[PDB]
Design an enzyme around this catalytic site. Sequence first.
Site, mmCIF file in Angstrom:
data_model
loop_
_atom_site.group_PDB
_atom_site.id
_atom_site.type_symbol
_atom_site.label_atom_id
_atom_site.label_comp_id
_atom_site.label_asym_id
_atom_site.label_seq_id
_atom_site.Cartn_x
_atom_site.Cartn_y
_atom_site.Cartn_z
ATOM 1 N N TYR A 1 0.823 -1.188 0.000
ATOM 2 C CA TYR A 1 0.000 0.000 0.000
ATOM 3 C C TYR A 1 0.876 1.265 0.000
ATOM 4 C CZ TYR A 1 -4.418 2.412 0.961
ATOM 5 O OH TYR A 1 -5.502 3.267 0.984
ATOM 6 N N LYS B 1 -3.206 8.188 3.424
ATOM 7 C CA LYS B 1 -4.318 7.872 4.322
ATOM 8 C C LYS B 1 -4.010 8.236 5.781
ATOM 9 C CE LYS B 1 -7.205 6.195 1.199
ATOM 10 N NZ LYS B 1 -8.306 7.079 0.715
HETATM 11 N N1 LIG Z 1 -11.675 -0.407 -3.058
HETATM 12 C C1 LIG Z 1 -11.158 -0.560 -1.837
HETATM 13 O O1 LIG Z 1 -10.784 -1.796 -1.328
HETATM 14 C C2 LIG Z 1 -10.898 0.558 -0.874
HETATM 15 C C3 LIG Z 1 -10.673 0.194 0.429
HETATM 16 C C4 LIG Z 1 -10.533 1.177 1.395
HETATM 17 C C5 LIG Z 1 -10.662 2.504 1.014
HETATM 18 N N2 LIG Z 1 -10.852 2.830 -0.297
HETATM 19 C C6 LIG Z 1 -10.965 4.249 -0.640
HETATM 20 O O2 LIG Z 1 -12.236 4.440 -1.202
HETATM 21 C C7 LIG Z 1 -12.222 5.594 -2.020
HETATM 22 C C8 LIG Z 1 -12.941 5.314 -3.344
HETATM 23 O O3 LIG Z 1 -12.197 4.542 -4.243
HETATM 24 P P1 LIG Z 1 -12.753 3.161 -4.870
HETATM 25 O O4 LIG Z 1 -11.941 2.036 -4.362
HETATM 26 O O5 LIG Z 1 -14.214 3.202 -4.893
HETATM 27 O O6 LIG Z 1 -12.296 3.298 -6.384
HETATM 28 P P2 LIG Z 1 -12.891 4.046 -7.666
HETATM 29 O O7 LIG Z 1 -14.250 3.565 -7.973
HETATM 30 O O8 LIG Z 1 -11.800 3.778 -8.623
HETATM 31 O O9 LIG Z 1 -12.984 5.596 -7.311
HETATM 32 C C9 LIG Z 1 -11.824 6.374 -7.217
HETATM 33 C C10 LIG Z 1 -12.388 7.748 -7.509
HETATM 34 O O10 LIG Z 1 -11.399 8.724 -7.265
HETATM 35 C C11 LIG Z 1 -11.611 9.755 -8.195
HETATM 36 N N3 LIG Z 1 -10.458 10.645 -8.325
HETATM 37 C C12 LIG Z 1 -9.112 10.375 -8.434
HETATM 38 N N4 LIG Z 1 -8.454 11.550 -8.569
HETATM 39 C C13 LIG Z 1 -9.400 12.539 -8.594
HETATM 40 C C14 LIG Z 1 -9.327 13.917 -8.742
HETATM 41 N N5 LIG Z 1 -8.122 14.465 -8.933
HETATM 42 N N6 LIG Z 1 -10.488 14.682 -8.760
HETATM 43 C C15 LIG Z 1 -11.712 14.079 -8.614
HETATM 44 N N7 LIG Z 1 -11.804 12.710 -8.497
HETATM 45 C C16 LIG Z 1 -10.663 11.975 -8.514
HETATM 46 C C17 LIG Z 1 -11.892 9.007 -9.499
HETATM 47 O O11 LIG Z 1 -12.597 9.787 -10.430
HETATM 48 P P3 LIG Z 1 -12.260 9.686 -12.021
HETATM 49 O O12 LIG Z 1 -12.398 8.226 -12.395
HETATM 50 O O13 LIG Z 1 -13.234 10.591 -12.720
HETATM 51 O O14 LIG Z 1 -10.860 10.113 -12.322
HETATM 52 C C18 LIG Z 1 -12.768 7.886 -8.978
HETATM 53 O O15 LIG Z 1 -14.077 8.357 -9.040
HETATM 54 C C19 LIG Z 1 -10.776 6.042 -2.131
HETATM 55 O O16 LIG Z 1 -10.529 7.087 -1.213
HETATM 56 C C20 LIG Z 1 -10.024 4.809 -1.697
HETATM 57 O O17 LIG Z 1 -8.725 5.190 -1.299
HETATM 58 C C21 LIG Z 1 -11.035 1.879 -1.247
HETATM 59 C C1 LIG Z 2 -6.188 -2.235 -0.172
HETATM 60 C C2 LIG Z 2 -7.631 -1.745 -0.217
HETATM 61 C C3 LIG Z 2 -7.723 -0.542 -1.120
HETATM 62 C C4 LIG Z 2 -7.373 0.706 -0.608
HETATM 63 C C5 LIG Z 2 -7.473 1.849 -1.388
HETATM 64 O O1 LIG Z 2 -7.269 3.079 -0.867
HETATM 65 C C6 LIG Z 2 -7.937 1.752 -2.698
HETATM 66 O O2 LIG Z 2 -8.065 2.931 -3.384
HETATM 67 C C7 LIG Z 2 -7.035 3.385 -4.193
HETATM 68 C C8 LIG Z 2 -5.777 2.797 -4.246
HETATM 69 C C9 LIG Z 2 -4.826 3.281 -5.128
HETATM 70 C C10 LIG Z 2 -5.150 4.361 -5.924
HETATM 71 N N1 LIG Z 2 -4.229 4.789 -6.959
HETATM 72 O O3 LIG Z 2 -3.165 4.197 -7.076
HETATM 73 O O4 LIG Z 2 -4.596 5.683 -7.702
HETATM 74 C C11 LIG Z 2 -6.370 4.980 -5.864
HETATM 75 C C12 LIG Z 2 -7.315 4.470 -5.009
HETATM 76 CL CL1 LIG Z 2 -8.920 5.116 -5.076
HETATM 77 C C13 LIG Z 2 -8.289 0.529 -3.219
HETATM 78 C C14 LIG Z 2 -8.111 -0.584 -2.445
HETATM 79 F F1 LIG Z 2 -8.199 -1.784 -3.045
#
Ligand SMILES: NC(=O)c1ccc[n+]([C@@H]2O[C@H](COP(=O)([O-])OP(=O)(O)OC[C@H]3O[C@@H](n4cnc5c(N)ncnc54)[C@H](OP(=O)(O)O)[C@@H]3O)[C@@H](O)[C@H]2O)c1
Ligand SMILES: CCc1cc(O)c(Oc2ccc([N+](=O)[O-])cc2Cl)cc1F
Lengths: 254, 254, 254, 254
Positions: free
Chosen positions: B155, B162
């Site tokens: 990560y 974060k």
């Molecule tokens: N998936 C997981 O396991 C996980 C776990 C824990 C926490 N999170 C957190 O959850 C949040 C949501 O991410 P996700 O996993 O749902 O993935 P996601 O669907 O890929 O969403 C990531 C979002 O971030 C936006 N983003 C990136 N740079 C940006 C910017 N400069 N201005 C406006 N929007 C921007 C992207 O928009 P565009 O596509 O339009 O660029 C996209 O909508 C993040 O904070 C991530 O770190 C995710």
């Molecule tokens: C490990 C669980 C997990 C945590 C996250 O924060 C996650 O979201 C991101 C991780 C990396 C990037 N990136 O590289 O642009 C962006 C985002 Cl939105 C997705 C996850 F799978």
Amino acid sequence: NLENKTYVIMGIANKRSIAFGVAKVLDQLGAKLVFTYRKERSRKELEKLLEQLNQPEAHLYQIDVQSDEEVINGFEQIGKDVGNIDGVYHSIAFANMEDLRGRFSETSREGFLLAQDISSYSLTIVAHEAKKLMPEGGSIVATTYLGGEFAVQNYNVMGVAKASLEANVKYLALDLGPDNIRVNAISAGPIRTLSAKGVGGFNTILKEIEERAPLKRNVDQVEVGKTAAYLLSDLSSGVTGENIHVDSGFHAIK
Amino acid sequence: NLENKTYVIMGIANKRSIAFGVAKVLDQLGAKLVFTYRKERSRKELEKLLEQLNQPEAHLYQIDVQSDEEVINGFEQIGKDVGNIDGVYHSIAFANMEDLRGRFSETSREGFLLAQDISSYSLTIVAHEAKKLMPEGGSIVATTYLGGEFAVQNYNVMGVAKASLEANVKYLALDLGPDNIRVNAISAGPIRTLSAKGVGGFNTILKEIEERAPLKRNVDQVEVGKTAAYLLSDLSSGVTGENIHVDSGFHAIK
Amino acid sequence: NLENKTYVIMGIANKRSIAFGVAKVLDQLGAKLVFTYRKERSRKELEKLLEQLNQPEAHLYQIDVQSDEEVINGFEQIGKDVGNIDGVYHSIAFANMEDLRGRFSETSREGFLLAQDISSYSLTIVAHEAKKLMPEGGSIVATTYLGGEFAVQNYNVMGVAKASLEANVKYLALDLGPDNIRVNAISAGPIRTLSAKGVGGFNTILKEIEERAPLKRNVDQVEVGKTAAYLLSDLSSGVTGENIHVDSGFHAIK
Amino acid sequence: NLENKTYVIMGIANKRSIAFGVAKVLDQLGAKLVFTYRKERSRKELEKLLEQLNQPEAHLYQIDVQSDEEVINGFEQIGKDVGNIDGVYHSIAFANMEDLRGRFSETSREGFLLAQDISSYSLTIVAHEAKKLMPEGGSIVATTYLGGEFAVQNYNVMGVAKASLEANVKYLALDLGPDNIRVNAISAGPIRTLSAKGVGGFNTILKEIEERAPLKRNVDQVEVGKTAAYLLSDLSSGVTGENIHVDSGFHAIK
Ligand SMILES: NC(=O)c1ccc[n+]([C@@H]2O[C@H](COP(=O)([O-])OP(=O)(O)OC[C@H]3O[C@@H](n4cnc5c(N)ncnc54)[C@H](OP(=O)(O)O)[C@@H]3O)[C@@H](O)[C@H]2O)c1
Ligand SMILES: CCc1cc(O)c(Oc2ccc([N+](=O)[O-])cc2Cl)cc1F
Ligand SMILES: NC(=O)c1ccc[n+]([C@@H]2O[C@H](COP(=O)([O-])OP(=O)(O)OC[C@H]3O[C@@H](n4cnc5c(N)ncnc54)[C@H](OP(=O)(O)O)[C@@H]3O)[C@@H](O)[C@H]2O)c1
Ligand SMILES: NC(=O)c1ccc[n+]([C@@H]2O[C@H](COP(=O)([O-])OP(=O)(O)OC[C@H]3O[C@@H](n4cnc5c(N)ncnc54)[C@H](OP(=O)(O)O)[C@@H]3O)[C@@H](O)[C@H]2O)c1
Ligand SMILES: NC(=O)c1ccc[n+]([C@@H]2O[C@H](COP(=O)([O-])OP(=O)(O)OC[C@H]3O[C@@H](n4cnc5c(N)ncnc54)[C@H](OP(=O)(O)O)[C@@H]3O)[C@@H](O)[C@H]2O)c1
Ligand SMILES: CCc1cc(O)c(Oc2ccc([N+](=O)[O-])cc2Cl)cc1F
Ligand SMILES: CCc1cc(O)c(Oc2ccc([N+](=O)[O-])cc2Cl)cc1F
Ligand SMILES: CCc1cc(O)c(Oc2ccc([N+](=O)[O-])cc2Cl)cc1F
Ligand SMILES: N[C@@H](CCC(=O)O)C(=O)O
Ligand SMILES: N[C@@H](CCC(=O)O)C(=O)O
Ligand SMILES: N[C@@H](CCC(=O)O)C(=O)O
């Protein structure tokens, strides 16, 4: 909405009890509530306070959590009277003034262990017996305070019993997880209750929340109840082993 | 029960976005929603995904949080179009692969700051602008992960972004508390999204939750959604500066 | 006993600097010391402070940690001049007054990232370059403050930068651990230094330690330096990714 | 260098005890040591062990910490034989094997209170009696395990007792800080000792540190002894209420 849900609330003594904040809330969300108490004085107070609730029946059980039999038999009686339950709210704790109002280093063995017994171990044995009426899973919530996490002036032996409670929640979480029983805690802010009278300098604790906490105000029992409703319902289905501070933000600052 | 409430949701890219789970949840609770996006392709998905919602009007705003002007203008137009709002859900993070997939000690300066800018700082400026539409108070929720509290394999730079984000939440809580604005995090468990494909080892991270987390299963976007509803509603009134782990209990074990 | 050890100490500005308390200790313990600085004015202080130490040679290098070239060529010169080293004491932070002395929600993007760069990212690039001179392993220590774990009034953008630093330490500890490089922090209590003048309300912060910390006094630079000696030596061989509070106990209370 | 220091070491059982690693280190550093032990039938084996140290005479006292009288009388005798002390290393714990090896939910009241008694309460009474021998201040150190901060499979009742112990240290530190007595904990990684045979899955626990901790190795009793020397000496003035993980960094990862 908690229609068709049933909750056991342990630890109401009067209208100021945190547990009664839980009950007004769950009651206004439609849940069927069952009540436990130690002292007959508290049962009398439950009979009164029940007049303010929707509850169309009083379900009241005496359970002193110091007695294995009362816990074993209270919950077994509950299962026979109202059937399966959806959760327990645990709002029970105790320590002697005589230990509370001295130096922590002067705490007595029997006082220390009494505080552990009522304030921590009670959750383990309640969980074990309450498990028996949740074949489908459920939710257990215990009430703690910031003194379990940091040394707070004058909280002394109850602080060590809270640290113990909070670890109890975690170990219960890992244990009953596979059974779909979630186990969590609310770290409430200070709140004028019958038991608050046991804590030295409690008025100065209150004041400091108002002065220093992010929301610059104290919390109340209904605010604890609104978070209990979250933890005790499906809204929090992926949350176990957690400690939510209902405390105006004071945990987050220094 | 968020009839007559309005929430700005930032960071939907497609159907598996965590933020889309927040949206279906608040949509079913009766909320009016306003969506912000970066790429044109994300706005295209949003117009599609809106057909599954009850939302009778599409409110869509391009906001790249790297740009002060876009955040400033985006929110001012939101207020001109729908009036005052009750909260914001922040679901935005970014780091370069080339940093994410190398040794953390090899992280570039430009990539480190890139991940701070989008993934942390953006909260601060969004709060500042969203505050202008919350004259009577409200709620701001950001999405974090457990890698902000502990060093999680692969990560890397996002871990430090974060940690920053989580401190941003607390400092925003203490700053905006007096204006009755609450600010909290959800520490979501791992969830298959488009951004998950950035994380080295994510399948082994997935499997490890199921075999070791209290609930022995992974969570999803709706579960994060339900904890968002709690945080964005009056049910969580005494709660700010907090970090709720929607992660099956995994944070609590070792 | 640190004879035949060599440590690089970054961030002495005058006799009050925390890093000079570390230097006095490591110097009293027999270590060879190498100093880096940013401003001409700090090199002149160093030259003067070196007369109070037992160091027979002066090894002074200008490294502005905002410059990769200066860090890279700085440590490479260090390798050429004194050879392999045993560790680095990092004692460097900066944020704009203009950002510190305003509301946190009002923090500028450039001030936030400036503070991350000098106060957090600097440790990553320093570790990468110092690692080249620790083929057999070694120890790296950074200086943090409690406001990276909690929101402390007036600490503002620097509290988010310390949260970043503290995570930085944990990720580096993980990355570099197989190389027998330990990475730790010390969280110092408030100390009168040139930089303490930037934090609003410092004197109030001082007094509250005297009043409320377990030891009911403030710490000083030499107390930080003695704990540095422990973390920089073999006495701490099993310890990494740790944060030691040298703050009279203030971190454990609330 | 600890010449003209005297420390009481409680909990040597055999050559594998963590307390014997403490003893070796402190002995090497020139301290006078006093040993306490539980059962009179293992005085002869302890006497044989201590022929290995450079102690000029055996100072051995039988103290079972389940008895106040034994603690009170033991430390009084020590004062009369040896004079004032500089600190105490506490290395004592106990839980039933029968509560250790069930579901945590199935723990008996007796077994849960016994573990609290021996593993937490004993620190309190020890500090109270040892404080009598430290009129000018001193240092107290107890041994804990990561299981008191998180739920660890098979650690059950001992985990809740360590949570208790760890708060105990915080409350003791606040109480006793004005007396210039500091109280801290060392959180040891897994170590093969007499008592480790009692934990289910121990080798699995070893293997996990080897594989996942930053240092990719296990720690040993001598590494605990070196952090103990730091905590028991003036190198750690300013440190109290603290928990130092001597565990290869395992605490900082997830
Ligand atoms: N998936 C997981 O396991 C996980 C776990 C824990 C926490 N999170 C957190 O959850 C949040 C949501 O991410 P996700 O996993 O749902 O993935 P996601 O669907 O890929 O969403 C990531 C979002 O971030 C936006 N983003 C990136 N740079 C940006 C910017 N400069 N201005 C406006 N929007 C921007 C992207 O928009 P565009 O596509 O339009 O660029 C996209 O909508 C993040 O904070 C991530 O770190 C995710
Ligand atoms: C490990 C669980 C997990 C945590 C996250 O924060 C996650 O979201 C991101 C991780 C990396 C990037 N990136 O590289 O642009 C962006 C985002 Cl939105 C997705 C996850 F799978
Ligand atoms: N007030 C606060 O600021 C505060 C803050 C944080 C957490 N809490 C926690 O909230 C919980 C409830 O306290 P409260 O403030 O609401 O005070 P309260 O109104 O006095 O309630 C305490 C309850 O504990 C019950 N109790 C004690 N020992 C018992 C036993 N052996 N068996 C059965 N019941 C027993 C009492 O019942 P009987 O009267 O019938 O004996 C009483 O109903 C406790 O866990 C407390 O530590 C309070
Ligand atoms: N004083 C406290 O109460 C306290 C408490 C906890 C933590 N800390 C931390 O302790 C550390 C030392 O601060 P201090 O109190 O000892 O104050 P200080 O004497 O003013 O030292 C701060 C140092 O930072 C250096 N620095 C700033 N920017 C730099 C850059 N871009 N490149 C290289 N060096 C740079 C300064 O060098 P130049 O002067 O040459 O520019 C100065 O020597 C910092 O991490 C601080 O956050 C201080
Ligand atoms: N081994 C590990 O992986 C590990 C890891 C972290 C923390 N720790 C902690 O380190 C400490 C020492 O454990 P260890 O691994 O060194 O095991 P150990 O060698 O078996 O030592 C435990 C000691 O506690 C003593 N003890 C138990 N009950 C007592 C009582 N009622 N009164 C006086 N002494 C009593 C035992 O005495 P008898 O032999 O006479 O019964 C024994 O000397 C414990 O606190 C343990 O929890 C151990
Ligand atoms: C300081 C906030 C606070 C925390 C508490 O746990 C609390 O509850 C109790 C404290 C002491 C006793 N006792 O002595 O038996 C009982 C209870 Cl229920 C009250 C509080 F006011
Ligand atoms: C309140 C305790 C405390 C913590 C600190 O980090 C500290 O150091 C700095 C504070 C501010 C700046 N600046 O604005 O550039 C720089 C530094 Cl080096 C001083 C302290 F007095
Ligand atoms: C798993 C790491 C670990 C932690 C420990 O606290 C430990 O010590 C004990 C464990 C159990 C008992 N008992 O049941 O009596 C006693 C002790 Cl001294 C040993 C360890 F191996
Ligand atoms: N100090 C008094 C009064 C406490 C208060 O300020 O509420 C007590 O120990 O009860
Ligand atoms: N290890 C591969 C696959 C990860 C997975 O999904 O398990 C990667 O670096 O992406
Ligand atoms: N509060 C004043 C004085 C500083 C102090 O109290 O140390 C300031 O803003 O700097």
